[PDB]
Design a binder for this molecule. Structure first.
Ligand code: HEM
Ligand code: HEM
Ligand SMILES: C[C@H](O)[C@H](O)C1=Nc2c(nc(N)[nH]c2=O)NC1
Ligand SMILES: C[C@H](O)[C@H](O)C1=Nc2c(nc(N)[nH]c2=O)NC1
Ligand SMILES: N=C(NO)NCCC[C@H](N)C(=O)O
Ligand SMILES: N=C(NO)NCCC[C@H](N)C(=O)O
Lengths: 362, 362
């Protein structure tokens, strides 16, 4: 039944892809080759043009992403030639270096070899290539609680952290033919970090906060024409609220709102004073100012929504339908001040797209 | 087919209602009487206990309401005896007076006669009993844009406003047997209004803002045991954000954020400064402070979410399932700071409940 499903999805992808590219003539021929290949091996190999355009279409169909206006400018890195653990490590080191680009971040994706008979060639365990560790001793919390389970798995393999609130996790992945994964500590020269300060309030630095510069999701599956690429890291640039309103504010994460209120000089006695709302405004203002000072790319939520509006218009103009998830598109601060809040979206799934997959650990 | 549907809904309501009331014995008898009544007239008459408990259950099932913790304390006013236009006017005047209660607002509902053969006995045109008019001359906007259509209909009947930003609309309703509705100007002694000032910034009064004290939704249909009460006004008390983050902030309503930014001393040049988020915080703080000073009931969003949490727990403890609409339950300011944001809800419809109905005007 797997051979049937593969053929269906290949028929729809080739036609739609070559149509957008203006190569409708070649559709008839290529399909005959893919068909013969499927009967011969049980799968097919995408051309460079096909995989490159496929990863772009997948971003365009991501219902939960507010940055879809820049979909056609994605930088695609083809690494389907990797065979060893050293090959993977160097490619991952290269992704961080080129995407960072000394601060002027470049949206990118690295393509590793896909699954064969459902079996993987390379399996990445990290959620993001750069992330902080999390420990929960009987005493209290240290680090990022969302990293608990992955942190425990790394220490079960010989790794050991320093136990500060910001320990960098190591790269951890498994090669086909091995029962357990291998790990490599990240070189400090490759990772940019940004200390958090405030434009007018000098005491803000007493909190000693900081965050990393580039978010690189590395545990999702990219599906193109029936072919499953379980390993394919991708990155864009941060939207301010992700850090100041969630990562540092959530009670289940760093939980910093009370401390913020203290350094800015306001009381935390009464809810009618709305101290939580005021603390959120100063913290978020601090995140945008600090990233800009050091020259690292970032975007505020009002500018972001404005760009997404232009995206909706372009899609209508091109003749394509729009899909999206309202519950993820609205910003976590001042949502009613953007256009997104005042309209509705169709949350249907269209392929090619990016998908969630089960975690090896846990 | 209408006689069939009525019987079904009556069977489920009586059993469920008498069960909660601990009168399961009387279920067998009452059902036999209702059945005979339906064959005789084509409808049935609720007892005082049945209608009172029915309006309470309906509030408990309202997916979009965050104030459901106080459902069992609702004040029910039975006015199914009205026959003339003067009878309706006095009852509506009485609802505003008793619900206001000199500031200590009392959640209430007034029950008018229900529909017969789909035909209404009394039809209310107002959206809320107390609301401001809206005009849109070629010059610009004056008043509340959301009141445009209803305002035009009132002037088509002989009414005339003064054209300020806060003209009070008149009560307007139609009696069975008349082709057009009648109107009555509201007595100023019955309507409480609150001027908006700021606790620390004295220049805030230069904006000359104000809003009314009690929101009374009067155009929804209450359905209990197959019986349709198209006319049944109800009220609770305001949640701060409804006024400061929507009524006075939306670009399609009063659109005041830029003016607010001016009186507090901040610039509106750059989105990275987050001036819209800061203006929203001071305006909302002003609304809570002003209502309290004058002694009128109001609640902030953090306290409100906290109360709703206790509601979820009580429902679980009583053995009933929970239903709700996430998109309406989350507050329009700092949503990620409340528990509601971090969970999911089942948006199924359970009866008895309140429903939308077509507008006579427009
Ligand atoms: C160029 C700048 C980019 C910005 C400004 C941006 C911003 C966002 C934001 C705000 C979210 C929500 C994250 C959260 O709440 O945790 C998101 C989700 C997502 N974005 Fe982007 N993104 C960018 C680039 C990309 C790229 C390059 C891709 C893919 C090639 C992409 C695919 C998606 C997908 C699938 C999600 C959902 C993730 C999940 O379900 O956990 N985005 N993006
Ligand atoms: C006692 C205090 C009350 C508070 C604090 C409260 C608060 C709220 C809020 C914030 C909304 C959203 C309004 C909007 O976004 O426009 C709402 C909606 C609603 N509430 Fe309440 N409410 C109260 C009492 C009541 C009462 C007394 C009833 C019914 C007997 C009720 C029935 C509902 C319903 C059906 C909606 C949806 C209205 C719509 O769809 O337009 N609430 N309530
Ligand atoms: C996770 C669950 O679906 C829940 O709706 C939310 N979390 C998030 C959210 N929105 C964003 N962007 N990110 C989240 O983590 N909204 C909803
Ligand atoms: C009206 C439409 O359903 C849209 O989701 C919204 N308006 C509102 C909303 N939330 C509230 N409480 N009130 C609204 O007017 N969220 C959604
Ligand atoms: N802005 C982007 N992608 O470019 N974001 C991805 C998800 C990141 C996650 N919200 C974090 O704070 O780490
Ligand atoms: N808080 C309550 N009901 O008690 N609200 C009802 C809806 C009111 C509407 N949001 C307004 O601002 O007028």
């Amino acid at each position: 039944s797997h051979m049937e499903i593969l053929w269906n999805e290949a028929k729809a992808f080739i036609a739609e892809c070559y149509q957008e590219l203006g190569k409708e003539e070649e559709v008839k021929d290529r399909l005959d080759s893919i068909k013969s290949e499927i009967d011969l091996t049980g799968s097919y190999v995408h051309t460079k043009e096909e995989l490159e355009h496929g990863a772009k279409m997948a971003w365009r169909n991501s219902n939960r992403c507010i940055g879809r206006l820049f979909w056609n400018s994605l930088n695609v890195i083809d690494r389907r030639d990797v065979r060893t653990k050293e090959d993977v490590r160097d490619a991952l080191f290269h992704h961080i270096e080129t995407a960072t680009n000394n601060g002027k971040i470049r949206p990118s994706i690295t393509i590793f070899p896909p699954e064969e008979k459902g079996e993987k060639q390379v399996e990445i365990w990290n959620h993001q290539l750069i992330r902080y560790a999390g420990y929960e001793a009987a005493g209290e919390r240290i680090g990022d609680p969302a990293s608990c389970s992955l942190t425990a798995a790394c220490e079960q393999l010989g790794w050991r952290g320093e136990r500060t609130d910001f320990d960098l996790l190591p790269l951890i992945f498994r090669m086909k033919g091995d029962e357990q994964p291998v790990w490599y500590e990240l070189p400090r020269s490759l990772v940019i970090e940004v200390p958090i300060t405030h434009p007018d309030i000098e005491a803000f630095s007493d909190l000693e906060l900081k965050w990393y510069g580039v978010p690189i999701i590395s545990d999702m599956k990219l599906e193109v024409g029936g072919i499953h690429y379980n390993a394919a890291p991708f990155n864009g640039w941060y939207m301010g609220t992700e850090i100041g309103a969630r990562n540092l504010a959530d009670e289940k994460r760093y939980d910093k709102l009370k401390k913020v209120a203290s350094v800015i000089g306001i009381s935390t006695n009464y809810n009618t004073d709305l101290w939580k709302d005021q603390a959120l405004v100063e913290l978020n203002k601090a995140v945008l100012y600090s990233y800009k000072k050091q020259g690292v790319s970032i975007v505020d939520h009002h500018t972001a929504a404005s760009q997404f509006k232009r995206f909706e218009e372009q899609e209508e103009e091109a003749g394509r339908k729009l899909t999206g998830d309202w519950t993820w598109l609205i910003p976590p601060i001042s949502p009613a001040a953007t256009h997104i809040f005042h309209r509705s979206y169709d949350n249907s799934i269209v392929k090619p797209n990016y998908f969630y997959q089960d975690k090896p650990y846990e």
